[PDB]
Scaffold this motif. Sequence first.
Motif, PDB file in Angstrom:
ATOM      1  N   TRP A  97     -11.528   3.930  20.732  1.00 51.76           N
ATOM      2  CA  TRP A  97     -10.599   4.058  19.742  1.00 51.76           C
ATOM      3  C   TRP A  97     -11.011   5.455  19.988  1.00 51.76           C
ATOM      4  O   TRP A  97      -9.220   6.439  19.397  1.00 51.76           O
TER       5      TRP A  97
ATOM      6  N   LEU B 273      -6.041  13.253  14.517  1.00 51.85           N
ATOM      7  CA  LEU B 273      -6.033  11.635  14.529  1.00 51.85           C
ATOM      8  C   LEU B 273      -4.893  11.216  14.834  1.00 51.85           C
ATOM      9  O   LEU B 273      -4.405  10.145  14.413  1.00 51.85           O
ATOM     10  N   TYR B 274      -3.398  12.436  14.436  1.00 52.50           N
ATOM     11  CA  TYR B 274      -1.917  11.492  14.836  1.00 52.50           C
ATOM     12  C   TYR B 274      -1.523  10.895  15.649  1.00 52.50           C
ATOM     13  O   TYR B 274      -2.132  11.099  16.765  1.00 52.50           O
ATOM     14  N   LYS B 275      -0.882   9.723  15.463  1.00 54.26           N
ATOM     15  CA  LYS B 275      -0.684   8.675  16.268  1.00 54.26           C
ATOM     16  C   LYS B 275      -0.042   8.837  17.521  1.00 54.26           C
ATOM     17  O   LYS B 275       1.083  10.313  16.699  1.00 54.26           O
TER      18      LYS B 275
ATOM     19  N   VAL C 255       7.387   5.484  15.882  1.00 58.79           N
ATOM     20  CA  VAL C 255       7.681   5.701  15.248  1.00 58.79           C
ATOM     21  C   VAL C 255       7.357   6.446  14.724  1.00 58.79           C
ATOM     22  O   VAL C 255       7.518   7.354  13.343  1.00 58.79           O
ATOM     23  N   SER C 256       5.248   7.102  14.540  1.00 59.33           N
ATOM     24  CA  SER C 256       4.201   8.333  14.725  1.00 59.33           C
ATOM     25  C   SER C 256       5.242   9.023  15.254  1.00 59.33           C
ATOM     26  O   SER C 256       5.133  10.589  14.121  1.00 59.33           O
TER      27      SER C 256
ATOM     28  N   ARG D 281      -7.130  -0.531  11.682  1.00 58.44           N
ATOM     29  CA  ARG D 281      -7.792  -0.982  12.677  1.00 58.44           C
ATOM     30  C   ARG D 281      -9.167   0.011  12.561  1.00 58.44           C
ATOM     31  O   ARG D 281     -10.007  -0.479  13.121  1.00 58.44           O
ATOM     32  N   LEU D 282      -8.873   1.497  11.928  1.00 57.72           N
ATOM     33  CA  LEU D 282      -9.975   2.262  12.379  1.00 57.72           C
ATOM     34  C   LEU D 282     -11.120   2.065  11.615  1.00 57.72           C
ATOM     35  O   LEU D 282     -10.895   2.833  10.246  1.00 57.72           O
TER      36      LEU D 282
ATOM     37  N   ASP E 257      -4.344   3.420   8.762  1.00 55.53           N
ATOM     38  CA  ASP E 257      -4.258   2.914   9.387  1.00 55.53           C
ATOM     39  C   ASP E 257      -6.136   1.917   9.564  1.00 55.53           C
ATOM     40  O   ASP E 257      -6.821   2.732   9.608  1.00 55.53           O
TER      41      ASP E 257
ATOM     42  N   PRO F 210       2.119  -0.752   5.414  1.00 56.71           N
ATOM     43  CA  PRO F 210       3.024   0.876   5.142  1.00 56.71           C
ATOM     44  C   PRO F 210       2.755   1.136   5.860  1.00 56.71           C
ATOM     45  O   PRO F 210       2.127   1.635   7.490  1.00 56.71           O
ATOM     46  N   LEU F 211       3.815   1.566   6.051  1.00 59.86           N
ATOM     47  CA  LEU F 211       4.575   3.133   6.867  1.00 59.86           C
ATOM     48  C   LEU F 211       3.883   3.966   7.710  1.00 59.86           C
ATOM     49  O   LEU F 211       3.255   4.227   8.535  1.00 59.86           O
TER      50      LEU F 211
ATOM     51  N   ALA G 163       0.627   3.552   7.621  1.00 55.29           N
ATOM     52  CA  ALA G 163      -0.478   3.303   8.856  1.00 55.29           C
ATOM     53  C   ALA G 163       0.041   3.110  10.384  1.00 55.29           C
ATOM     54  O   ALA G 163      -0.308   3.934  11.867  1.00 55.29           O
ATOM     55  N   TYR G 164       1.527   3.663  10.913  1.00 55.25           N
ATOM     56  CA  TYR G 164       2.050   4.378  11.995  1.00 55.25           C
ATOM     57  C   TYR G 164       1.873   5.669  12.377  1.00 55.25           C
ATOM     58  O   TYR G 164       2.171   5.633  13.609  1.00 55.25           O
ATOM     59  N   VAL G 165       2.091   6.321  11.434  1.00 52.76           N
ATOM     60  CA  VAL G 165       1.362   8.215  11.755  1.00 52.76           C
ATOM     61  C   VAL G 165       0.873   8.415  11.832  1.00 52.76           C
ATOM     62  O   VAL G 165       0.510   9.273  12.717  1.00 52.76           O
ATOM     63  N   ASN G 166      -0.226   7.802  10.833  1.00 52.99           N
ATOM     64  CA  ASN G 166      -1.615   8.328  11.035  1.00 52.99           C
ATOM     65  C   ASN G 166      -2.735   6.711  11.227  1.00 52.99           C
ATOM     66  O   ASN G 166      -2.718   6.330  10.087  1.00 52.99           O
ATOM     67  N   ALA G 167      -3.680   7.256  12.386  1.00 49.67           N
ATOM     68  CA  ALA G 167      -4.651   6.079  12.573  1.00 49.67           C
ATOM     69  C   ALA G 167      -5.836   6.470  10.990  1.00 49.67           C
ATOM     70  O   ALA G 167      -6.277   4.986  10.545  1.00 49.67           O
ATOM     71  N   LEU G 168      -5.904   7.708  10.190  1.00 51.73           N
ATOM     72  CA  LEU G 168      -6.405   7.472   8.740  1.00 51.73           C
ATOM     73  C   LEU G 168      -6.613   6.109   8.129  1.00 51.73           C
ATOM     74  O   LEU G 168      -7.046   5.760   7.297  1.00 51.73           O
TER      75      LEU G 168
ATOM     76  N   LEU H 277       8.381   9.211  12.399  1.00 54.21           N
ATOM     77  CA  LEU H 277       8.056  10.532  11.484  1.00 54.21           C
ATOM     78  C   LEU H 277       7.526  11.816  11.359  1.00 54.21           C
ATOM     79  O   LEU H 277       7.734  12.481  10.629  1.00 54.21           O
TER      80      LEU H 277
ATOM     81  N   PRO I 121       0.616  -1.502  -0.102  1.00 54.64           N
ATOM     82  CA  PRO I 121      -0.418  -0.213   0.232  1.00 54.64           C
ATOM     83  C   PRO I 121       0.864   1.178   0.103  1.00 54.64           C
ATOM     84  O   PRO I 121       0.700   2.414  -0.381  1.00 54.64           O
ATOM     85  N   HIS I 122       1.861   1.417   0.493  1.00 52.86           N
ATOM     86  CA  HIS I 122       3.000   2.195   0.634  1.00 52.86           C
ATOM     87  C   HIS I 122       3.263   2.637  -0.740  1.00 52.86           C
ATOM     88  O   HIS I 122       3.745   3.910  -1.016  1.00 52.86           O
TER      89      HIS I 122
ATOM     90  N   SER J 293      -3.057  13.783   5.642  1.00 47.74           N
ATOM     91  CA  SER J 293      -3.086  13.336   7.048  1.00 47.74           C
ATOM     92  C   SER J 293      -2.074  12.569   6.644  1.00 47.74           C
ATOM     93  O   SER J 293      -1.083  12.516   7.584  1.00 47.74           O
ATOM     94  N   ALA J 294      -1.337  12.112   5.589  1.00 48.07           N
ATOM     95  CA  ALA J 294      -0.359  11.790   5.694  1.00 48.07           C
ATOM     96  C   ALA J 294       0.824  12.275   5.073  1.00 48.07           C
ATOM     97  O   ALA J 294       0.939  13.304   5.284  1.00 48.07           O
TER      98      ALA J 294
END
Lengths: 49, 49, 49, 49
Positions: free
Chosen positions: D7, D33-35, D39-40, C29-30, C27, C17-18, C20-25, D43, A34-35, C3-4
């Motif tokens: 969440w 929403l930033y995690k 890693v977050s 999971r949400l 990721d 992907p990286l 997903a780690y930086v922002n929940a949107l 970044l 996806p990245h 967001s990214a």
Amino acid sequence: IEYSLPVPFHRFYSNPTICAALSDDIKRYVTEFPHYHRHDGGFPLPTAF
Amino acid sequence: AARRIPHFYRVRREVPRTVNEMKQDFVVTDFYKVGNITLYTELHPFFDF
Amino acid sequence: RISALPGLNNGQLAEEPLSAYVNALHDHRLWPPFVTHLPRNMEGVQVVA
Amino acid sequence: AHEYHNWLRSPFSRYSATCPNVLHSVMTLAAMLYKISPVSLVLQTKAHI
């Protein structure tokens, strides 16, 4: 679509979206990683290009 | 090579980032800091290495 | 797009992907409160009826 | 009613109450929403944000 073929080649003109929509193998490539779905370039070109 | 693009994309594997593209993304003042790995390569202003 | 970090977000450290780690949107999971179609991937997720 | 395992907590609704209707409010809700993670955090700090 059925009579078309995508060829992302240059430093520009390399949308992952359009080439993924045009051929299913590119869709598999994108959904596996996806990245790589980026418009800023760096979407990996074919090794020839 | 025009019709081989899906045949390349059949491989389900990424590619390492090119050294110039990895060099790119550092922020304006962050580029000089020792955390930037790529600095040993930025040798010359007229020619790239 | 906000967001990214489109300049920095490429790369991986798992099957994820990286981005997903930086922002929940990004990721997966949400889940949004209202859904019409199940996602293509649920690796870490389990749902209960 | 359980809310610590949820969440998205209550401050989001509390901000929605006083929210102005300009598009900047949607975007700032997105940036909200930033995690929080190593890693977050790395970044985010690489971009100087």
